[PDB]
Amino acid sequence: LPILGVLGGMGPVVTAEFLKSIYEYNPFIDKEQESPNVIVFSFPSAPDRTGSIDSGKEREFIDFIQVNLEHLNKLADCIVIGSCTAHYALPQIPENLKDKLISLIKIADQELQEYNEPTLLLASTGTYQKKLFQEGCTTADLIISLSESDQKLIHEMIYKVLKRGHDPLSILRDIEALLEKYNTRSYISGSTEFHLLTKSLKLKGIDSIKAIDPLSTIAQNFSQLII
Amino acid sequence: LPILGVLGGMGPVVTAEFLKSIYEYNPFIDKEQESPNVIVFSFPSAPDRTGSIDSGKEREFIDFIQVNLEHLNKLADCIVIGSCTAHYALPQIPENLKDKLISLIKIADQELQEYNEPTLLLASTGTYQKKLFQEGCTTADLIISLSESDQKLIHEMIYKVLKRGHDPLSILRDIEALLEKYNTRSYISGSTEFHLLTKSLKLKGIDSIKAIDPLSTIAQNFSQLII
Ligand SMILES: N[C@@H](CCC(=O)O)C(=O)O
Ligand SMILES: N[C@@H](CCC(=O)O)C(=O)O
């Protein structure tokens, strides 16, 4: 049977919620033995992703990701890293340890190709500085970048609200105002913590916003993706 | 840093919710790097616990638990198995692979000692047949056993409602009627799936029922227990 390996804890709150999403969008028909097999390494002691760039200690962070990929390579058939910003480590990781990897940036790129309307990239300043989405996506011309001022505002939402476990709906007004400002009805979860907003939106039945949310997509399409 | 290993998937829904509970009851002060390190093996392809007793294939199940304990022994400092009924496998597992194990039955026993009032054991028929709580707990005289008829009713709640992800509050009336019938204001989560009821009770602010719930206790006391 096929096993998903999650390298998480890079948002422990969102890592936990992602595992919930998997079984929410894969309810069994008769028996639990039908349901997805998953291994989660939820290690919040991972050095801050943006912080490791903002200081100089990228090597410390790249070593963290590398060692834990070696582990999961032995245990899982496919692997996801639960942080977009953490994908900046990948060019420094050997190609053999990345064979099983399902990239959140590629997953986002595919969904945006099908959607084919301009969409607002919500992400960390470090994800922005590293230009992961602009350099990674075939659909980069459909990505609307936040201005520097609005980048900082999103960074605040991620760390002050979403990472601390607070009600993701408490930033919905701020996000609608951004979506309006940038003249669009959609966003990309450039930070994984917007998985939490995406879930809270689908719960309340708000379908005015279109969320390109890689973790939602991976959860929904587990059976197709995980081989 | 100390790592909890969860052998779960024996209620994928509740396994996911337990990981959520850990970070809910351990919110960080300044940085995420403060937060609990956890490894979860969420393998629902574990053979049904009660079913493996009800057929003859206990060996198949004991092998599952044994192999996955060997794995987690190498990776974690403390280990929890996310199913009370699955603890029936332990007498057949070598003592060396159980050094790190934190027993849900012992955790329940301790909480009941401090509580010191008669309490209703809600569990699977297989947990009842194996008499895990009655044989395991120093506080066994404080445990009120469900009659055979009410055992089947609880088994139905676990599999038809709680394991399928449905709103745990939808069985609250049925549980209050049991609690009344057996003349008590408390229950033991003899099935881990009653972690889900326990959380839904603490959310709505219902403190008329006292839940002896091992997973809640482990989540709350992570820093003390996990060394
Ligand atoms: N979790 C977000 C931002 C911060 C972090 O990585 O911890 C991400 O997708 O990268
Ligand atoms: N999850 C319950 C009952 C059924 C099962 O083990 O899957 C328990 O504590 O054992």
Note whether B36 and B112 are within 8 A (CB). no
Q: Do B45 and A24 touch (CB under 8 A)?
A: no
Give how far A19 is from chain B: nearest CA, Å.
6
Q: Who contacts B127 (Cβ-Cβ below 8 Å, separation ≥6)? A: B50, B84, B85, B88, B133, B190, B191
| Helices A172-181 and A194-204, axial angle in degrees (round to 10) | 100
- Pocket probe for ligand 2: among B193, B197, B212, the residue whose CB has the most ligand atoms within 8 Å is B193
| Strand boundaries in chain B, DSSP class E | 3-8, 37-42, 78-81, 119-122, 143-145, 186-189, 210-212
Place of tokens 């088994």: B155
Query: Which of A172-181 are b and which e, b meaning 16 or more Cβ less than 10 Å from the residue's Cβ?
Result: beebeebbee
Going from the C-alpha of B120 to that of each of B176, B189, B213, the distances in angstroms are 11, 9, 12
A213 touches ligand 1 (CB under 6 Å): no
Helices (H) and strands (E) in chain B, counts: 11, 7
Give how far B190 is from chain A: nearest CA, Å.
19
Give how far B185 is from chain A: nearest CA, Å.
30
Task: Give the tokens for residue A58.
Answer: 């990228």
Place of tokens 């400002």: A181
Q: Do B19 and A34 touch (CB under 8 A)?
A: no
What spacing in Å lies between the alpha carbon of B86 and ligand 2's midpoint?
A: 7
* Residues of chain A positioned with their CB less than 8 A from the CB of B12: 22-23, 32, 35-36
Q: What is the DSSP letter of A39?
A: E
A125 touches ligand 1 (CB under 6 Å): no
Note whether B124 and B133 are within 8 A (CB). no
Relative to the alpha carbon of A31, which ligand is closest?
2
Measured distance CA(A154)–CA(A146) in Å, rounded: 9
Element of type H or E holding A7: strand A3-8
Measured distance CA(B65)–CA(B84) in Å, rounded: 13
Note whether B135 and B123 are within 8 A (CB). no
- Per DSSP, the three-state class of B143 is strand
Half-sphere exposure in the Cβ direction for B224 (13 Å, CA): 6
Note whether A79 and A7 are within 8 A (CB). yes
What spacing in Å lies between the alpha carbon of B152 and ligand 2's midpoint?
A: 14
Closest atom of ligand 1 to CA, residue B32: 7
Relative to the alpha carbon of B50, which ligand is closest?
2
Strand A186-189, strand A119-122: pairing = parallel
Note whether A197 and A203 are within 8 A (CB). no
Angle (nearest 5°) at CA A89 between A175 and A87: 35
Establish whether A193 is an annotated binding residue.
yes
Establish whether B127 is an annotated binding residue.
no
DSSP lists the bridge partners of residue A116 as none
Measured distance CA(B158)–CA(B125) in Å, rounded: 11
Task: Identify the burial level of A209 via C-beta atoms within 10 angstroms of its C-beta, where 0-12 means exposed, 13-18 middle and 19 or more buried.
Answer: middle
A158 touches ligand 1 (CB under 6 Å): yes
Place of tokens 């003592």: B95
